[PDB]
Write an enzyme that holds these catalytic residues in place. Structure first.
Site, PDB file in Angstrom:
ATOM      1  N   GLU A 103       0.862  -1.119   0.028  1.00 27.89           N
ATOM      2  CA  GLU A 103      -0.129  -0.139   0.008  1.00 27.89           C
ATOM      3  C   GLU A 103       0.800   1.028   0.020  1.00 27.89           C
ATOM      4  O   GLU A 103       0.805   2.244  -0.964  1.00 27.89           O
ATOM      5  CB  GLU A 103      -0.983  -0.102   1.269  1.00 27.89           C
ATOM      6  CG  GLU A 103      -1.615  -1.358   1.230  1.00 27.89           C
ATOM      7  CD  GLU A 103      -3.158  -1.105   1.851  1.00 27.89           C
ATOM      8  OE1 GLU A 103      -3.148  -0.948   3.038  1.00 27.89           O
ATOM      9  OE2 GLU A 103      -4.085  -1.205   1.010  1.00 27.89           O
ATOM     10  N   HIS A 116       0.486  -5.057   8.344  1.00 31.71           N
ATOM     11  CA  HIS A 116      -0.163  -4.130   9.195  1.00 31.71           C
ATOM     12  C   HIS A 116      -0.580  -4.675  10.478  1.00 31.71           C
ATOM     13  O   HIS A 116      -1.379  -5.664  10.629  1.00 31.71           O
ATOM     14  CB  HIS A 116      -1.391  -3.786   8.676  1.00 31.71           C
ATOM     15  CG  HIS A 116      -1.015  -2.689   7.402  1.00 31.71           C
ATOM     16  ND1 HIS A 116      -2.193  -2.396   6.349  1.00 31.71           N
ATOM     17  CD2 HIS A 116       0.209  -2.058   7.127  1.00 31.71           C
ATOM     18  CE1 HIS A 116      -1.586  -1.795   5.350  1.00 31.71           C
ATOM     19  NE2 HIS A 116      -0.498  -1.422   5.840  1.00 31.71           N
ATOM     20  N   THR A 195      -6.683   2.173   5.117  1.00 27.69           N
ATOM     21  CA  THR A 195      -6.502   2.246   3.880  1.00 27.69           C
ATOM     22  C   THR A 195      -7.767   1.119   3.057  1.00 27.69           C
ATOM     23  O   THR A 195      -7.882   0.962   2.070  1.00 27.69           O
ATOM     24  CB  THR A 195      -5.285   1.286   3.366  1.00 27.69           C
ATOM     25  OG1 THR A 195      -5.349   0.097   4.184  1.00 27.69           O
ATOM     26  CG2 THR A 195      -4.141   2.005   3.903  1.00 27.69           C
TER      27      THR A 195
HETATM   28 CL1  LIG Z   1      -8.985  -3.969  12.559  1.00 31.48          CL
HETATM   29  C1  LIG Z   1      -8.374  -3.388  10.838  1.00 31.48           C
HETATM   30  C2  LIG Z   1      -7.984  -2.209  10.786  1.00 31.48           C
HETATM   31  C3  LIG Z   1      -7.671  -1.790   9.423  1.00 31.48           C
HETATM   32  C4  LIG Z   1      -7.862  -2.438   8.441  1.00 31.48           C
HETATM   33  C5  LIG Z   1      -7.409  -2.285   6.993  1.00 31.48           C
HETATM   34  C6  LIG Z   1      -6.400  -1.178   7.059  1.00 31.48           C
HETATM   35  N1  LIG Z   1      -6.704  -0.060   7.176  1.00 31.48           N
HETATM   36  N2  LIG Z   1      -5.072   0.567   7.267  1.00 31.48           N
HETATM   37  N3  LIG Z   1      -4.448  -0.587   7.039  1.00 31.48           N
HETATM   38  N4  LIG Z   1      -5.042  -1.576   6.886  1.00 31.48           N
HETATM   39  C7  LIG Z   1      -8.506  -3.882   8.751  1.00 31.48           C
HETATM   40  C8  LIG Z   1      -8.479  -4.294   9.966  1.00 31.48           C
HETATM   41 ZN   LIG Z   2      -4.073  -2.933   6.199  1.00 30.95          ZN
END
Ligand SMILES: Clc1ccc(Cc2nnn[n-]2)cc1
Ligand SMILES: [Zn+2]
Length: 257
Positions: A103, A116, A195
């Site tokens: 990303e 992440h 995102t």
């Molecule tokens: Cl708990 C959670 C939080 C964010 C995302 C997706 C995301 N947002 N930012 N980076 N990933 C998926 C699950």
């Molecule tokens: Zn993510």
């Protein structure tokens, strides 16, 4: 019904989620020559010794490894952060090919994938509350490049065929997320957003400079997952990444010289 295809993908999300075109959207390109070393960034503290993993879930957008965040068991503090942020889950974004997937990009380079590790600010008491705050979440982003296998990812890889399709989950206890980290904790940080929808502008992004190496065989197995639920036509879970969004009025700070 948002996703990553031609007809429901990131270019469409603003229709349901107009904050898509907001002022602090993620991900961004990290221009390494324009990010400023910030000598005042405290050192970053990743304390995951006590982490309690629970379950792995294919939710139709990614696979999530979930942790017990009912107590301060696995936490992130320091660096740019005020207070304590509790690890709730981690997931990845990845590509259909090794040259794309992340990303965030680094001087426009796309990595094969991006991990992440998602944490919420304990001062807001639950995750739901936190996502409504400008400093509600801290996401630790770590790039994946294709090279030598990463041994601490293999327990993840090896279980994926048990969660092939949307809504499938499996037990994932006793997994130690420290094995997914690189050696260095040098990082970039900036204020941004989820995102994915609903794209809330509630994240302090902390993106590690040092990617981790994973094997081609490892990332190959990510690509065998399915967006679809069981007993539907197969849409391979690939390219679940949002492209880089306008930096607008933001500065990316570096923890390192
Ligand atoms: Cl708990 C959670 C939080 C964010 C995302 C997706 C995301 N947002 N930012 N980076 N990933 C998926 C699950
Ligand atoms: Zn993510």
């Amino acid at each position: 019904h948002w996703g990553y295809g031609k007809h429901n993908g990131p270019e469409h999300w603003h229709k349901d989620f107009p904050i898509a075109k907001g002022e602090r959207q993620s991900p961004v390109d990290i221009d390494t020559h324009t990010a400023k070393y910030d000598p005042s960034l405290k050192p970053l503290s990743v304390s995951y010794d006590q982490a309690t993993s629970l379950r792995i879930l294919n939710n139709g957008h990614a696979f999530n490894v979930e942790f017990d965040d009912s107590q301060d068991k696995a936490v992130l503090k320091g660096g740019p952060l005020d207070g304590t942020y509790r690890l709730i889950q981690f997931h990845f974004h990845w590509g259909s090919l090794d040259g794309q997937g992340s990303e965030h990009t680094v001087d426009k380079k796309k990595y094969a994938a991006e991990l992440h590790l998602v944490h919420w600010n304990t001062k807001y008491g639950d995750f739901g509350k936190a996502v409504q705050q400008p400093d509600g979440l801290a996401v630790l982003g770590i790039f994946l490049k294709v090279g030598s296998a990463k041994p601490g990812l293999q327990k993840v890889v090896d279980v994926l065929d048990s969660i092939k399709t949307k809504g499938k989950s499996a037990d994932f206890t006793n997994f130690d997320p420290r094995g997914l980290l690189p050696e260095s904790l040098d990082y970039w940080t900036y204020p941004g957003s989820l995102t994915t929808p609903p794209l809330l502008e509630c994240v302090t992004w902390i993106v590690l400079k040092e990617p981790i190496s994973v094997s081609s065989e490892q990332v190959l197995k990510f690509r065998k997952l399915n967006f679809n639920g069981e007993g539907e036509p197969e849409e391979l879970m690939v390219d679940n990444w949002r492209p880089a969004q306008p930096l607008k009025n933001r500065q990316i700070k570096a923890s390192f010289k």
